[PDB]
Amino acid sequence: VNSFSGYLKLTDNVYIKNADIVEEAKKVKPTVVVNAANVYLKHGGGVAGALNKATNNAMQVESDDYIATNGPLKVGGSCVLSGHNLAKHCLHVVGPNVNKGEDIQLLKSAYENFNQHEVLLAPLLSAGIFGADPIHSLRVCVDTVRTNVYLAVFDKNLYDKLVSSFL
Ligand SMILES: NC(=O)c1c[nH]c2ncnc(N[C@H]3CCCC=C3Br)c12
């Protein structure tokens, strides 16, 4: 039993809700919140800009030190950093950005990072400003993640479409 509330169950291990991941993280304080990161951990917009803003820029400060030490992530890769006031940990995951020409096949590799964590609150990777089809992202999520994932979809209109079209 966990504290996630109001989710629709899609499969044995995947759940979905129309919610703002920032407000959801603040309420649940999950062990792991997933950020829709880029390789530079520059949290400017989309989910990343919103999560970083909610940390009063502490996420960005921590991220800049991480990059200065380790260099950029790989597309499809991840790192675990602090969750600040939102969660115990933040799993920064880099899905391919279609608006940069990155290979959509890397979306499966990106979701594989979720399997290192028993339970996660997450957005749909590569959706929104990353330019991929969210219906496809949900399909890859369901077919790749085996741990318990609670997906937050900001747009109410998009949420209804993902549910109604789910196989
Ligand atoms: N500024 C923002 O993009 C968000 C702030 N919180 C969010 N929670 C969920 N998805 C978000 N964005 C996108 C990316 C994922 C696919 C649908 C949507 Br909608 C955001």
UniProtKB/Swiss-Prot annotation:
**Macro domain ranges (all copies):** 1-167
- In UniProt terms, what is the effect of altering residue 31 to A? In strain: Mu/B.1.621
Q: What is the regulatory mechanism acting on its activity?
A: Inhibited in vitro by GRL-0617.
The compartments listed are: Host endoplasmic reticulum membrane
Q: Give the catalysed reaction(s), semicolon-separated.
A: Thiol-dependent hydrolysis of ester, thioester, amide, peptide and isopeptide bonds formed by the C-terminal Gly of ubiquitin (a 76-residue protein attached to proteins as an intracellular targeting signal)
Membrane topology type, per the record? Multi-pass membrane protein
Q: What is the effect of changing residue 164 to L?
A: In strain: Gamma/P.1
Known function: Responsible for the cleavages located at the N-terminus of the replicase polyprotein. Participates together with nsp4 in the assembly of virally-induced cytoplasmic double-membrane vesicles necessary for viral replication. Antagonizes innate immune induction of type I interferon by blocking the phosphorylation, dimerization and subsequent nuclear translocation of host IRF3. Also prevents host NF-kappa-B signaling. In addition, PL-PRO possesses a deubiquitinating/deISGylating activity and processes both 'Lys-48'- and 'Lys-63'-linked polyubiquitin chains from cellular substrates.
Subunit-structure text: May form homohexamers. Interacts with N protein.
Q: What is this protein called?
A: Papain-like protease nsp3
Organism, as annotated: Severe acute respiratory syndrome coronavirus 2
Lineage at the top is: Viruses, Riboviria, Orthornavirae, Pisuviricota, Pisoniviricetes
